[PDB]
Design a protein around this nucleic acid. Sequence first.
RNA 1: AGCCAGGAUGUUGGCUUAGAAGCAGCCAUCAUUUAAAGAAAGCGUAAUAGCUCACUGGUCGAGUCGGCCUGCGCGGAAGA
Lengths: 176, 141, 38, 94, 136
Amino acid sequence: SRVAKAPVVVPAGVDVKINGQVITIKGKNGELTRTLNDAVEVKHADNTLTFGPRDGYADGWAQAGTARALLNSMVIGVTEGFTKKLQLVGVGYRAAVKGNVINLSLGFSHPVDHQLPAGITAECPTQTEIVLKGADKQVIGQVAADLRAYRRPEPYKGKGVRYADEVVRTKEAKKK
Amino acid sequence: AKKVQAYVKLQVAAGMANPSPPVGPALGQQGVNIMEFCKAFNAKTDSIEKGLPIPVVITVYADRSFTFVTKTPPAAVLLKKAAGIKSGSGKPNKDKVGKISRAQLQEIAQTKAADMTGADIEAMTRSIEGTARSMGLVVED
Amino acid sequence: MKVRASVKKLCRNCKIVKRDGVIRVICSAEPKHKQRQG
Amino acid sequence: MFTINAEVRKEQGKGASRRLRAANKFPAIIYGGKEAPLAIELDHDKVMNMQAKAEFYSEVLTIVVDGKEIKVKAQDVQRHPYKPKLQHIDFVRA
Amino acid sequence: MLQPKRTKFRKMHKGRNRGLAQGTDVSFGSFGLKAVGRGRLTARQIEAARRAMTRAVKRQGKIWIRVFPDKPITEKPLAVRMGKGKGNVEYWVALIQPGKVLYEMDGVPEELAREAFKLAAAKLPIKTTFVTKTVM
RNA sequence: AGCCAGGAUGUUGGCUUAGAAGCAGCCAUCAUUUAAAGAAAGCGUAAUAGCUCACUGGUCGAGUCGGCCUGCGCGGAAGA
Ligand SMILES: [Mg+2]
Ligand SMILES: [Mg+2]
Ligand SMILES: [Mg+2]
Ligand SMILES: [Mg+2]
């Protein structure tokens, strides 16, 4: 609610289209569409979107705020675009990108081709560094956690695929 | 006054110059020397006196030795040879143990020409009163 | 994790959350703190 | 200074005083002086917070019943055995 | 452990524990641990808790115990018929009505009293509550 | 509540200290400069520590915190 009440501002020529509960938000860099709860009502005017409860729905505000904060980041999307970055730690751990595929070598018998979805793309300043880029905040999210999944950092060395935004506490080993 | 890059502090007395047993191997292990601790060390250690514990800077970048401008001795170093016991504590607060005073350690602390806080020398005056009390001493202030 | 009738914050970094119908403790600082079934 | 509102008691006995407490009120009494004692009902929530302050028991209180000002002092009190609540109070006209 | 040092008689009738309690006000210390429920305490129970509270205030303050056994409890053992005389005593208990002050304490910060009174409660078969001293 | 800052001086604190420099230990818990900064909050180094904290400046801009009396609910809940 502190969140929902707080307006969101559609910058330069970001075309916004509401069709009931069905928002579309296109700009410099893409186009995302979401469907809002139902107990959410969103008003478009000026160059701002606002959100507020809808008569006779308990969760009104909460639904509003989550909707609020979504559309906000939809807009950031088709505009500045998000970017997750992972780095690969451990002898032999390398990676790189044929088209919309990331070839990961993470110590298994078979290297790993990870298919990239709908609207994300990647490259690799380094053999050991991957960088996803896209408009959909919740999707570069997944992909990041998925490339991660192949080899979650281990706690005795940090060997493994990690977000760059990630601290990896390590520990000793038991005495004898 | 800049940031992190060279400084330790682990010694016994200006008396001993560079020793091996209480310290030794780690008195230089990164750009400092187990052998150089009478050169810049005694660049004014013996000139003046050898009988007061004192540590110092290290300042290290990549220039052979090191440029550690040296300075002051603690304030419980002057509770052995200027105030009372060589050891101290004992049973610190089972009774008054030892005892000092205001005259005792006024000039002995008023000296420092390279340390202490606040130009009022009635303040950094008493700043030292308590390092004779971290052992549990009586106040004849 | 540990599972028992009385679950509790153990560190200041513990957090209590409900998920599905189930009281859980998520500590951001000490895996041993993870509890379930409060 | 300590002002306590209170209407007098239409009925009496236990059935009546239990009902009283059933509906966040509780009964008390006033006595001493040459007057007949006066049976009363006080609102619970209000008198509760009053008495939480230890001047309640020291000072002379002023009980207001039917727009008349009775001056009194806390003389005794019965407390519910394990809940933080009053059961009954004795006020002394002084 | 508590228990009569001597008693006019050896065994008591089962009795019944109806009623509301007779010692209801912190009347020796600054804080009581009071019984919100009805039931029986055992010398071991009184004791296990007693230790718990004392543990928690190390050697500071003073403690009272407002309750006390005096009621002997029998039991027939395994493999015995019904009858053939009343059981053999085996422990003592104290009938508790709701509103008994159980323990009082005094000589500590209110907060620590709570802390101690807490830990002790954990050993008691009946729900309890932290009371304080009152003028009148 | 978040986030930008700071986190000090006797003092690397005397100490049954092999090394302790806040840390199982040591004993008290005082005392300087400041906006405030704990002989003490911590994951914890060979010891310096490197790094966030109790506490305080700024930013932000209106509510925020958890005890009391009570209704209905949740977990605690494994058998042929
Ligand atoms: Mg699930
Ligand atoms: Mg009846
Ligand atoms: Mg704030
Ligand atoms: Mg239940």
